[PDB]
Design a protein around this ligand. Structure first.
Ligand SMILES: Nc1ncnc2c1ncn2[C@@H]1O[C@H](COP(=O)(O)OP(=O)(O)OP(O)(O)=S)[C@@H](O)[C@H]1O
Ligand SMILES: Nc1ncnc2c1ncn2[C@@H]1O[C@H](COP(=O)(O)OP(=O)(O)OP(O)(O)=S)[C@@H](O)[C@H]1O
Ligand SMILES: Nc1ncnc2c1ncn2[C@@H]1O[C@H](COP(=O)(O)OP(=O)(O)O)[C@@H](O)[C@H]1O
Ligand SMILES: Nc1ncnc2c1ncn2[C@@H]1O[C@H](COP(=O)(O)OP(=O)(O)O)[C@@H](O)[C@H]1O
Lengths: 548, 605
């Protein structure tokens, strides 16, 4: 009572009701009060993620004390918190010893409470502990406890671990609707259970950084305040919260709705916006992804295991680069592993990395280490027909059971990824001998487990226009830093085709071909003159090359 | 009422009407009042960097407060500050008691509380003062990011700098106040040029005050040059005066070796004397037919800042860059494909076309040894800085260990080597314009690659202290000799299987040098012999080599497995050996020229 400047009270202000009723989490209080009444290894410590309700539990304990529900062994005691940030090189221990003296002079069982004790731990308080005068209650997280309370601890023999995992959705919903009338008078508009459950599920779904009991309340109170500030609609609602979540993340409030039909029905041209032609292919792949996400197939299998073959450079990779954007929300999600190194017997274990203590161990495997983190990729396999006939064992093990075991000992799961097996077979075969070749080259019962084996059709010599038009409308962005406009002339743009297609490399060069030509040919004018940001820069076909 | 002395006021200054120009940031003000009208985690803190305009944000907040645009809980709120120009712990009770007795109507604004955080924390846990904060992001993360004891009452509010179309209005709202001291005119041309030019180029400070300091320094520079003789009329005159005194002290030199230094200092004087006259004559033209700020002094102050060149078209730099592919062919021979590529990416930066958030160029060339994959980078650094010593060259052969990543980043605070700073970061933090050479990238530990993966497409990286140096105006070069025997597929596969494809992704064109041939070797023999003459011109012993001699040389050392170094070895072993045999045996004393000629096998001097 003499040095009460680096610590607060919990039972005094509980005579005022300055604390929230603590509905939920009625088991942890029994656990704590049971550990607090032993003879040794008493004075527990709460262990859990930040923002889950550890302080909430200790406050509820204080409130049950002031009410009177505990055994008389614990009856008639106060609780005091400790702020570690109020002290901090040195003199931290001076104030700490001044505090411990007061605690000992308390001459009773006046229980303390220390939040984030792993800032203290040490050998200064253990004699205070192993004598029977203080009782501390703590708080930290699991990995912290494993660091500051496990390596140099030697005090783990007097701290009891109590776990506070995290609430469920249907439980934090009750928590919220219990903590509702408060804000209904603080701001005061109106509250709908629809808004509450919407906040809960949307935070759970898209806010993957924080945790539930406060993560939800954050959005609820911020949205209520935004609605109050609006009055410079007299109700709150689910859209009234999706707008907040969108202003929080960046993704628009439209897509923040149904994610099954509103996705399967988008498998239309929204793919064909980035991919071109091959409409049979896109429709087939869309069937594959739709009927697989229905919810009747075996739950332990990839979400798609189709392959496609034919000519090069027509967009074989581009279909996957676009598909990763629509489903997993990124084009930096695919992983491509060439089956050209894997032409020997031994190198098949390079994509796992076998033993602890050999050359490639901490480097992990090529196929697994890129999956156990971010398990939502889109795996490609260039020129699979060249891989040694031993990789197929690992591959069949994948697509027959959604699991695999790396070198470390971890278990990885492939039950929500998409396999893709490209190939350059089909040199002359149109549709007749190409399938005979791919039925005789690969194992016959392997292809029994695949999905559709669709064959890309060549670029229609007219349907080079759409791809080059996408390329050109893209490069229309290039010189927007100067706002210079571009000229198009269908003879010139078609003159790129017959001299840049090169159907041995698909359509690969048509990016450098045009960017180097236009950019570094204008690089004289763009420095001297001849152009400004209203000039379409008329470029045309000289009888030989592409002058202006 | 006892804080009227220890703190200023903004409830009365706003009624009187004096406040700095606040335009924009109205959504920010709305965010601040919105977070103030909450139950928990209210009372925000502003996060940014010095000179973004959060001071202006709170000032406009105060003006809007006195005007009235508020909710019910904001009955003018009499927002005040707590003067950090008021500084002991016995007085702070007297300061805090006034706010404590109040009902939350005198809320404070702790400008730069980053150092304030015992006394304010318990008085915050009861919830009586707002204590509006404003600091920077790194100091925030250091001080009040790890302490969750107080992070339950602080909601950071991010702010950005650029408001270009209103930065010009701010310049206007300040243009009046900068024309008073400097007897100059600050034109809208200058406003709109500085608002538009120093933004991407001088990327060390931030627009809302760097666009201010540019105009301030331009004003001071012009006011200086309004004095009779201006810049470049005060320069060659100070040069020619000094040059003369260097000549009148060399005539009285009884030496023959200093005559050739007297025979040149005279000439450069005779060359500089004219250009003094030509400018002086043209001066009177403008004297009877600069007195105002424009767009040229802007680029002037840009160039004099951070060494970065950023002008309209700098009238001495025009024919150099169109001659680059040819000007570079004086030092590097062959690899037309490589010189075209390395060249087409310097103009696209001096033109303003290239991507503004990526290095001004970053790509790799590799191939057999003794081809020039290092002389090319050296030649590049020689004609941009005019001295080859001005290239940052780090070797990746010493970084073969994992724990050597902290060698070029620095060691964390509290360890032994801490004040020494980094090795790569500490060179690009101060004066970033150089070219950085990565010798033998293959020999490095395949973990430093994860740092260049950051530098690519982001343009910066962090060090042991936590700050971020910028990498947006340099060129990054990679050298290696993977494969070294394969045509094009072995080396392609080797680099593809040695580096991540998402590291080769952000790279520009990947270059493969060919190797030298007989037709390109005579041009190298000439360079070698010219450099050798320039070297042994310190004893005035010029040489005289015959065409059969140069052909014998260029034929002798050619073998297409080691490149060109055998040529230097043969030059030494065949000429310098004999010459140094004679030079200390008398008979070839200073001031001499010895001819060489082909003999049947050797070439006698
Ligand atoms: N059962 C509950 N009853 C009432 N409020 C609860 C309950 N569980 C969580 N909360 C609230 O959730 C929020 C989380 O606050 P804290 O309990 O302090 O978080 P924490 O889990 O203790 O970790 P810290 O201390 O925030 S780092 C507070 O507003 C609590 O009041
Ligand atoms: N095309 C060239 N232009 C200029 N100097 C050249 C050329 N080819 C060779 N040389 C000279 O020959 C030597 C080769 O220098 P480097 O460029 O370091 O060799 P390299 O090609 O880098 O091979 P490595 O892999 O670095 S050992 C230097 O003395 C160069 O000056
Ligand atoms: N249908 C298409 N839609 C869009 N771009 C396409 C299409 N077909 C080919 N392309 C383009 O052709 C080029 C080759 O892409 P890709 O098939 O990934 O090449 P590679 O086979 O060399 O890996 C890319 O620029 C790609 O955008
Ligand atoms: N939007 C604005 N336009 C023009 N001048 C401004 C604006 N906001 C503030 N100013 C003035 O310019 C100064 C720029 O520095 P300031 O914004 O105070 O930086 P800080 O408070 O972060 O140190 C302000 O102090 C103010 O006097």
């Amino acid at each position: 009572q003499a040095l009460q400047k680096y610590s607060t009270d919990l039972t005094a202000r509980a005579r005022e009701g300055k604390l929230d009723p603590v509905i939920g989490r009625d088991n942890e209080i029994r656990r704590v009060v049971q550990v607090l009444s032993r003879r040794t290894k008493n004075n527990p410590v709460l262990i859990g993620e930040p923002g889950v309700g550890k302080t909430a539990i200790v406050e509820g304990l204080a409130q049950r004390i002031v009410a009177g529900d505990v055994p008389e062994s614990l009856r008639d005691k106060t609780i005091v918190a400790l702020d570690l940030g109020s002290m901090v090189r040195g003199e931290f221990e001076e104030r700490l010893k001044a505090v411990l003296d007061d605690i000992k002079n308390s001459a009773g069982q006046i229980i303390t409470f220390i939040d984030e004790l792993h800032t203290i731990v040490g050998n200064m308080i253990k004699p205070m502990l192993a004598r029977g005068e203080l009782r501390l209650v703590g708080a930290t997280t699991l990995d912290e406890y494993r660091k500051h309370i496990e390596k140099d601890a030697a005090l783990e023999r007097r701290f009891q671990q109590v776990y506070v995992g995290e609430p469920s959705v249907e439980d934090t919903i009750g928590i919220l609707r219990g903590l509702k009338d408060r804000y209904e008078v603080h701001h005061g508009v109106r509250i709908t259970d629809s808004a509450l459950v919407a906040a809960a599920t949307l935070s759970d779904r898209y806010i993957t950084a924080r945790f539930l009991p406060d993560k939800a309340i954050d959005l609820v109170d911020e949205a209520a305040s935004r609605l109050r500030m609006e009055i410079d609609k007299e109700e709150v609602g689910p859209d009234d919260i999706a707008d907040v979540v969108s202003a929080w993340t960046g993704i628009p409030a439209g897509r923040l709705l149904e994610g099954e039909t509103a996705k399967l029905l988008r498998m239309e041209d929204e793919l064909g916006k980035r991919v071109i032609g091959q409409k049979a292919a896109v429709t087939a792949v869309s069937d594959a992804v739709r009927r697989s996400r229905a919810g009747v197939s075996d739950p332990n299998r990839p979400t798609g295991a189709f392959m496609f073959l034919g000519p090069t450079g027509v967009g074989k990779t581009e279909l996957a680069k676009a598909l990763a954007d629509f489903l997993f929300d990124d084009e930096r999600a695919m992983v491509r592993i060439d089956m050209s190194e894997y032409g020997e017997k031994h190198t098949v274990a390079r994509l796992i990395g076998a033993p602890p203590g050999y050359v490639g161990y901490e480097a992990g495997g090529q196929l697994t280490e890129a999956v156990r983190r971010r398990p939502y990729t889109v795996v490609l396999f260039d020129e699979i027909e060249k891989a040694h006939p031993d990789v197929f064992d690992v591959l069949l093990q994948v697509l027959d059971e959604g699991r695999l075991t790396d070198g470390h000992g971890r278990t990885v799961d492939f039950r929500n990824t998409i396999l893709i097996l490209t190939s350059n077979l089909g040199s002359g075969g149109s549709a007749e001998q190409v399938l005979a070749a791919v039925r005789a080259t690969f194992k016959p019962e392997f292809i029994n487990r695949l999905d559709d084996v669709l064959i890309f059709e060549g670029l229609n010599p007219e349907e080079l226009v759409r791809i080059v038009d996408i390329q050109l409308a893209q490069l229309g962005k290039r010189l927007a830093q100067r706002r210079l406009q571009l000229q198009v002339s269908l003879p010139a743009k078609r003159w790129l085709a017959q001299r840049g297609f090169d159907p041995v490399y698909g359509a690969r060069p048509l990016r450098r071909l045009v960017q180097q030509a236009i950019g570094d040919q204008l690089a004289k004018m763009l420095l001297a003159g001849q152009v400004h940001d209203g000039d379409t820069v008329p470029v045309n076909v000289s009888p030989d090359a592409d002058s202006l």
